[PDB]
RNA sequence: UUUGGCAUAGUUCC
DNA sequence: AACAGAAACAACGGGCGGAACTATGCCGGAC
DNA sequence: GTCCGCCCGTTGTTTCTGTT
């Protein structure tokens, strides 16, 4: 609806992509925090993460809650086909 | 390739006081044989041979006509299990008789015993 | 923002809107009807070539950099000397 | 603006100056064919060039199966409900996400942008 | 504009005053510290068709150890200084019995003039400084540690103490910005005093060569 | 400079077997089209496109000199692989190149100019569309813009050269045996070793080409079959390769 | 045969065309060679696809692409194009039916096979640059059904989405619960196991 | 270095084209001195090339007519002469002098439209 | 108790 | 007018990870 | 037993001003 206003120093595409990536990162981090704080005192992932042996809270988050966004060359997945990522999507689809 | 491309390559080749002219007409391919006699792929593997078939051609000689049939111009390697191999269409019992694995997929050449695979 | 303006390169293309080359030998009867009044005012109180170089400056970019048409005119005079003529409208 | 061609040699007509009648003449370099033009403007250069694609959008895009469709935007002319839509589909556009619409009713081909 | 030209002249004068103070010459505090309005009042606030015309701003000052050894700071009025201008300046130096002089240039000097400056080196010493190179004092930049020019006595003592031949010191080019600022010839040794992260201070030495 | 700054962009074509670049209008005239109206009919399909017309105008401003097919052919042929000492031979070489090596897929017969002009106009039109930002530039990594050379194409390309060499050898033998005028034989004139050894060597070593020129020959075709496991065999038999370094 | 059918189906040729009747016509390319123009691209494409599905004049291997925006029709008979089979969705229902499934599951002593499935116009071969004008559905009984409308114009359907994996990666169990480098490493190490 | 080369090439091209447009005898327009009734400050000043006394007198009349129209709206010679003299003193070239006078005239007319004394 | 080399391909580990 | 100092552009050449383990083809041709 | 794919340090070429 053209109601989005550009951020100074950024293009319209850049500001839209920044807002989308920020929302998705907030979602991934919130789900990760929920997964962390819902663990138990006998959990072996927690045993191997708290002691610093091997693993990380991001690995626990990806195992339990959400794998997260996939990026290519620092940007979201590009439009390999004509204006769409795969033949299973309509053209010009910017959903998550 | 064997059905069409070699024939097209032969045909598209330009033909080569008294005058002499030559013109190659068409080709032929027998099943693979050994010259010292069909040669089975397992024998080709064991004896370090090459699994191949001879390619003939009709050549016509004219002076300014005389026809030469089945002119031997060389041996062309044959891909296993292809239409021009000795294992094409055989059943599993025949494959076992020839000491060939019925599960072998085929699609490779036997050059001096070793098995070669072309890479796309 | 003033220093930001001072430290960033900017040619005329960054602010121009459109340009065109006309053929208008008549100082009074001008092919373009917009310039009539002020071009007549300029010519009434004084050779030249009959050709023109009319350019149009984008208002948004003109007012963003805090630029002034007098400043553009004096820059043109410095860059080309008095062998050009320049007449400019106002905002 | 546009290119105009001589009727004798069919070559491009360059502008030439008539220093007697203070008039503009279009003349070619092959023959001596002259003309008088109505544009009176040799050259035009717009650097904004924010061309509205409604001139460049074909009405035949309505047969694309890969395009999204909506029924909340009825056609202005024929009142048809279903209408395909897409984005600018233009390179060398600094910034644009505006939608464009094409009516899917055959022979209507109305192409607007709300 | 006239304001900008006055500002540039004032900044160049202030930097040259600082340069002379660093080089050991005798410049007073009031001369060192002039406000823009004071400079406008003293020597014209209007440059174009005004009293300051890149002349009468020339500075003659005597070294703190010898009033006989003095230096000039000339302001050519020509964007491209020429052979005849250099000859005029050398004539003025000869008549005033002055050995060293600085020359601030509007845009640049022709290579012929630069070579005609180099040729008379034992007779006279003249240095070229562009107008852009003096709008700032490079010494005041925080990336530049303090430099001290060392006397031949300090050099000898240092070499004897560390048992070093001058080949074995770090070097600094005679075209270096700070070297030109201090007016150092080949064979002189500068001392660098800078704070350190692991010791608290560290004194280095550089040979001009 | 002033003239380059006013011209802006010009369109040039790099024809094969020619020393350096040629402006496009020169090639179109060499095809036999003289009028700017006809050339613009071949290039700009819809004349109600002033931006395209203005874009192509500087290319036509290089036609101020050349106006005829003969001189255009001369200009094209001046830059051959070996520049001639005469002019008729140079013009014949130019015509031969424009008839044999420029766009072979359109046609090679005598009357192929009417279609070569259209295809070259299409190339120029697509270039203009790319320059105007109306179509997306292609990417080499898109897999619709790729082909795969399997055993058929590989062995056919290999066999063309060997059959050509066999023809050369039989020709040489025939000429040598016929200059005497005595007689001529066929079986003695054919060296089967050429074809047999060539195919066998190329399959045995993997250097796809003749043995004498195994320097630029692309190595890595015809590997020896993996037999460690059945999965290894299958995944070897179904394998691709990108010739990128 | 494709050129002959094009001539039979009212396709004006280049040498018989005035340069004014080309702006509103869609160019036809066959093997990258511009052969003519046409004025009814939609009906032409419908007829060509019907002929390819019947397997009458055009072999199943040939691909046909229509660039709707740029008004071009490209037909390839070339060798080396890579293609995979896809199911056909006509309106919203697969053309594959329970009768086909039963005739397939009685495959022995019935001489009904994949060729007889292809000849019925049920499945189709789609190469890479024909996939750019197609709308695919990953699963029939999940994506054809009535939902909140995402796409109601599906043109094909996937046989099974797990057929995107190669020979060595078809042995990994639960590859969708793994990490991609781990799947790659197993694809490497599957060629070194001893059996 | 490429920008400097292009700027030199442009300057040579421009100077060549302007020399082909310069006639052999550029008639130096004779400076006619002010008349005894000339109300201009520094009327005999030749500081601005090609600016005549009659041009400055015309520019002064435009300022007077504008100020007269403004005063009639809000219910003058000395002020017009000061406005002209300030504009003269600040201008370096005749075209900028004329433009700065016309700007002052436009500003006076804006004040009159707004019902404000200039 | 005596010693070939050149090239190409594949694989292992960071 | 002749000479000389300095600079813009163009062409040319060298440079590009570390180890390790298997295998296979080939080392000149006619007379 | 005889003949047959990208970067950037050097050096050149050419050009453009200054001196006498
Ligand atoms: Zn004409
Ligand atoms: Zn409608």
Swiss-Prot record, chain B:
Family: Belongs to the RNA polymerase beta chain family.
Function statement: Catalytic core component of RNA polymerase II (Pol II), a DNA-dependent RNA polymerase which synthesizes mRNA precursors and many functional non-coding RNAs using the four ribonucleoside triphosphates as substrates. Pol II-mediated transcription cycle proceeds through transcription initiation, transcription elongation and transcription termination stages. RNA-dependent RNA polymerase that catalyzes the extension of a non-coding RNA (ncRNA) at the 3'-end using the four ribonucleoside triphosphates as substrates. An internal ncRNA sequence near the 3'-end serves as a template in a single-round Pol II-mediated RNA polymerization reaction. May decrease the stability of ncRNAs that repress Pol II-mediated gene transcription.
Organism: Bos taurus (Bovine)
Coiled coil (UniProt feature): none
Protein name in UniProt: DNA-directed RNA polymerase II subunit RPB2
Stretch forming the signal peptide: none
Subcellular location field: Nucleus
From Swiss-Prot, chain C:
Post-translational modification: The tandem heptapeptide repeats in the C-terminal domain (CTD) can be highly phosphorylated. The phosphorylation activates Pol II. Phosphorylation occurs mainly at residues 'Ser-2' and 'Ser-5' of the heptapeptide repeat and is mediated, at least, by CDK7 and CDK9. POLR2A associated with DNA is specifically phosphorylated at 'Ser-5' of the CTD by CDK7, promoting transcription initiation by triggering dissociation from DNA. Phosphorylated at 'Ser-2', Ser-5' and 'Ser-7' of the CTD by CDK9 (P-TEFb complex), promoting transcription elongation.
Localization per record: Nucleus; Cytoplasm; Chromosome
Domain of life: Eukaryota
Signal sequence extent: none
Written domain comment of the UniProt record: The C-terminal domain (CTD) serves as a platform for assembly of factors that regulate transcription initiation, elongation, termination and mRNA processing. The trigger loop allows entry of NTPs into the active site, switching between an open and closed state with each NTP addition cycle.
Free-text function comment from the UniProt entry: Catalytic core component of RNA polymerase II (Pol II), a DNA-dependent RNA polymerase which synthesizes mRNA precursors and many functional non-coding RNAs using the four ribonucleoside triphosphates as substrates. Pol II-mediated transcription cycle proceeds through transcription initiation, transcription elongation and transcription termination stages.
Species: Bos taurus
Gene this chain is encoded by: POLR2A
From Swiss-Prot, chain E:
Alphabetically ordered keywords of this record: Acetylation, DNA-directed RNA polymerase, Isopeptide bond, Nucleus, Transcription, Ubl conjugation
PROSITE patterns from the UniProt entry: RNA_POL_H_23KD (PS01110)
MF term (GO), any: DNA-directed RNA polymerase activity
GO biological processes: transcription by RNA polymerase II; transcription elongation by RNA polymerase I; tRNA transcription by RNA polymerase III
GO CC annotation terms, alphabetical: nucleus; RNA polymerase I complex; RNA polymerase II, core complex; RNA polymerase III complex
InterPro entries: Arch_Rpo5/euc_Rpb5, RNA_pol_Rpb5_N, RNA_pol_Rpb5_N_sf, RNA_pol_subH/Rpb5_C, RNA_pol_subH/Rpb5_CS, RPB5-like_sf
Predominant location category: nucleus
Protein family: Belongs to the archaeal Rpo5/eukaryotic RPB5 RNA polymerase subunit family.
Name of the protein in question: DNA-directed RNA polymerases I, II, and III subunit RPABC1
Record lineage: Eukaryota, Metazoa, Chordata, Craniata, Vertebrata
From Swiss-Prot, chain G:
Intracellular or extracellular location(s): Nucleus
Binding site for RNA: 192
Transmembrane segments: none
Source superkingdom: Eukaryota
Role, per record: Catalytic core component of RNA polymerase II (Pol II), a DNA-dependent RNA polymerase which synthesizes mRNA precursors and many functional non-coding RNAs using the four ribonucleoside triphosphates as substrates. Pol II-mediated transcription cycle proceeds through transcription initiation, transcription elongation and transcription termination stages.
Assigned protein family: Belongs to the RNA polymerase beta chain family.
Subunit details: Component of the RNA polymerase II (Pol II) core complex consisting of 12 subunits: a ten-subunit catalytic core composed of POLR2A/RPB1, POLR2B/RPB2, POLR2C/RPB3, POLR2I/RPB9, POLR2J/RPB11, POLR2E/RPABC1, POLR2F/RPABC2, POLR2H/RPABC3, POLR2K/RPABC4 and POLR2L/RPABC5 and a mobile stalk composed of two subunits POLR2D/RPB4 and POLR2G/RPB7, protruding from the core and functioning primarily in transcription initiation. Part of Pol II(G) complex, in which Pol II core associates with an additional subunit POLR2M; unlike conventional Pol II, Pol II(G) functions as a transcriptional repressor.
Protein name as catalogued: DNA-directed RNA polymerase II subunit RPB2
Species this protein is from: Bos taurus
Stretch of the intact protein here: 540 to 734 of 1174
